[PDB]
């Protein structure tokens, strides 16, 4: 199969430089271009230019002229992004793709999110969340979990390890003061807890934070 | 540089009606050589990178549904999708690779209607771990709504309170269409224990009055 890995997510702060990968795999790496494409939060896509894999030139689009740079490590099928003098306006998806004789992108990779800013990296807090001892229990019941006062994204959370999936919604973080918080709920029978343990399971891969939250009653 | 026009913004249909979204482009996409307009559609849904669906205008890539078709020569395309349903709900793109640069139009999102359905309202006090600190966040989960629009109030001992509150709503369900969202009051662990009536009032338009859930601290 054909596939296309890039690097996890990037915190850097203005004025320094970045630099993330994309490995190719399942075809001929120099036998098609590389495209970059990129898009900023809640926006739209926007072509950066490509790099001929054969040749090792690059072309930017009149946006990214400058501070921008495709390179290749042909040995390995990786294509390279590298940005200098990163601005706060930096922030955002950069993905990688393939691009077909026919005009189009066949393949594409996951997306590297890199995020400009001053704000230093902290660890959230991971507090659960259990109906009030004095609440009215119903057939159903929703637990939660609040991730509060973290840096940068992302946090990952899951349920019983991934074995509670339905029922659940993590809710976008939302950043204040250089902090994000974040919150998830479950809903499970009011016949499965607290009789049958429920916890989320919340990492913070910039903090190597790692914490199993048991949901307890009040 | 081609500009590539696209409208709607956004579209709203009920599962099963079929939608239709246009794409206009500056100037003929339309290559000689190959007779081929050099026009693609690509769907993305949230967090995830972009799909082709349509390329050469009207050519399906193989793995897509006969329900999606793309049609247009020149400047005028259009992408149809039949029996909508909610795994379509995302933004949908078209791309030109006509003459670089290539250039993607601004997308059209797709968002499903529903029955209108009140959400189901949970609130919890702070956590013992976070007032072991000096934190007290309050937080109430308005969970599987429709539509989106919701209104949150905190009042504490009866009194509003605009200040401390952040609010974050997810993203249309991939599977039943509803819309969840989370309120979260954050106060000192002092302002806390200072008051005891704690509630989350939601305005929606499924009801005349504010689903209204609470808690009074001396009762815990």
């Known amino acids: 199969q054909i596939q296309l890995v890039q690097s996890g997510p990037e915190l850097k702060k203005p004025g320094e430089t970045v630099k993330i990968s994309c490995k190719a795999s399942?075809?001929?790496?120099?036998?098609?271009?590389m495209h970059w494409v990129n898009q900023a939060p809640g926006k739209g896509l926007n072509w950066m230019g490509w790099?001929?894999?054969?040749?090792?030139?690059?072309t930017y689009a009149d946006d990214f002229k400058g501070r921008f740079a495709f390179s290749l490590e042909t040995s390995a099928s990786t294509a390279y992004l590298q940005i200098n003098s990163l601005k706060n306006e930096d922030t955002a998806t950069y993905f990688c793709?393939?691009?077909?004789?026919?005009?189009?992108?066949?393949?594409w990779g996951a997306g590297t999110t890199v995020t400009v800013s001053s704000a230093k990296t902290t660890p959230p807090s991971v507090y659960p969340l259990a109906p009030g001892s004095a609440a009215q229990t119903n057939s159903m019941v929703t637990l939660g979990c609040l991730v509060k006062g973290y840096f940068p994204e992302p946090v990952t959370v899951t349920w019983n390890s991934g074995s509670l999936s339905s029922g659940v919604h993590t809710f976008p973080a939302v950043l204040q003061s250089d902090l994000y918080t974040l919150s998830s709920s479950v809903t499970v029978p009011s016949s499965t807890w607290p009789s049958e343990t429920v916890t989320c399971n919340v990492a913070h891969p910039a903090s190597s934070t790692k914490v199993d939250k048991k949901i307890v009653p009040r | 540089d081609i500009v590539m026009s696209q409208s709607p913004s956004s579209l709203a249909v009920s599962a099963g009606e079929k939608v239709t979204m246009s794409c206009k482009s500056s100037?003929?996409?339309?290559?000689?050589?190959?007779?081929?307009?050099?026009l693609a559609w690509y769907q993305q849904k949230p967090g995830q990178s972009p799909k082709v669906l349509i390329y050469?205008?009207?050519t399906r890539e193989s793995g897509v549904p006969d329900r999606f078709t793309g049609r247009g020569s020149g400047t005028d395309f259009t992408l149809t999708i039949s029996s909508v349903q909610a795994e379509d709900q995302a933004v949908y793109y078209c791309?030109?690779?006509?003459?670089?640069?290539?250039?993607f139009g601004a997308g059209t999102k797709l968002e499903l209607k529903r029955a209108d359905a009140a959400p189901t309202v949970s609130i919890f006090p702070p956590s013992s771990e976070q007032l072991t600190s000096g934190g007290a966040s309050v937080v109430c989960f308005l969970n599987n709504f429709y539509p989106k629009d919701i209104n949150v109030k905190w009042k504490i001992d009866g009194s509003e309170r605009q200040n401390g509150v952040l609010n974050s709503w997810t993203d249309q369900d991939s599977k039943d269409s509803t819309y969840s969202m989370s309120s979260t009051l954050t106060l000192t662990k002092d302002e806390y224990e200072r008051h005891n009536s704690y509630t989350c009032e939601a305005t929606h338009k499924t009801s005349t009055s504010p689903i209204v859930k609470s808690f009074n601290r001396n009762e815990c």
């Open positions: 791309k030109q690779a006509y003459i670089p640069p290539l250039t």
């Open positions: 793709a393939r691009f077909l004789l026919r005009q189009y992108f066949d393949v």
């Open positions: 100037q003929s996409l339309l290559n000689s050589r190959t007779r081929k307009n050099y």
């Open positions: 399942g075809y001929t790496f120099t036998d098609f271009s």
């Open positions: 050469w205008a009207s």
């Open positions: 790099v001929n894999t054969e040749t090792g030139e690059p």
